[PDB]
């Protein structure tokens, strides 16, 4: 199946810095029609699932411009302008190109000390 290199594992940043979660793939997640299939995820302690981007960069209806997704067909990253206190938590990503869909991710965004 298609592999996905998830990185980094941890992201000790400061409240105000920038972010860049990486989510690579073995092959291009581009379909014959030219459509891409990859989404991002974010979770806290025990709240409902959160979605920032569902299509490479396409943000969800409610996601501030602070969050941006981009990269090549074999590279996807979650960049954040200013990592605030709400951005903290756990991040993940997934693809909807192959079946079963391959899931991955786990970047721990915790503030340094």
Curated annotation (Swiss-Prot):
Q: Which SUPFAM superfamilies match?
A: Immunoglobulin
Q: Which GO terms describe its biological process?
A: adaptive immune response; immune response
Q: Where is this region: Complementarity-determining-2?
A: 55-61
Q: Where is this region: Framework-1?
A: 1-23
Name a Pfam family for this protein.
V-set
- Give GO cellular component annotations, separated by semicolons: immunoglobulin complex
Q: Where is this region: Complementarity-determining-1?
A: 24-39
Record's InterPro entries?
A: Ig-like_dom, Ig-like_dom_sf, Ig-like_fold, Ig_sub, Ig_V-set, IgV_Light_Chain
Give a GO molecular function annotation for the protein: antigen binding
The set of disulfide-linked cysteines is 23-93
Q: Does the keyword Methyltransferase apply?
A: no
Q: Where is this region: Framework-2?
A: 40-54
What are the UniProt keywords, alphabetically? Answer: Adaptive immunity, Disulfide bond, Hybridoma, Immunity, Immunoglobulin, Monoclonal antibody
Region annotation Framework-3: residue ranges? 62-93
Stored SMART domains: IG (SM00409), IGv (SM00406)
Q: Where is this region: Framework-4?
A: 103-112
Q: Region entry Complementarity-determining-3: which residue ranges?
A: 94-102
Something else the entry says is:
This chain was isolated from an IgG2a hybridoma protein that binds digoxin.
- What is the protein name for this chain? Ig kappa chain V-II region 26-10
The root-end lineage is:
Eukaryota, Metazoa, Chordata, Craniata, Vertebrata
């Amino acid at each position: 199946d298609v592999v996905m290199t998830q990185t980094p594992l941890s992201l000790p940043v400061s409240l105000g810095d920038q972010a860049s979660i990486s989510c690579r793939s073995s092959q291009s997640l581009v379909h014959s029609n030219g459509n891409t299939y990859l989404n991002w995820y974010l979770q806290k302690a025990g709240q409902s699932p959160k979605l920032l981007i569902y299509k490479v960069s396409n943000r969800f209806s409610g996601v501030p411009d602070r969050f941006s997704g981009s990269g090549s067909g074999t590279d996807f990253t979650l960049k954040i302008s200013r990592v605030e206190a709400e951005d903290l938590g756990i991040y993940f990503c997934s693809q909807t190109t192959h079946v079963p869909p391959t899931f991955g991710g786990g970047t721990k965004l915790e503030i340094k000390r």
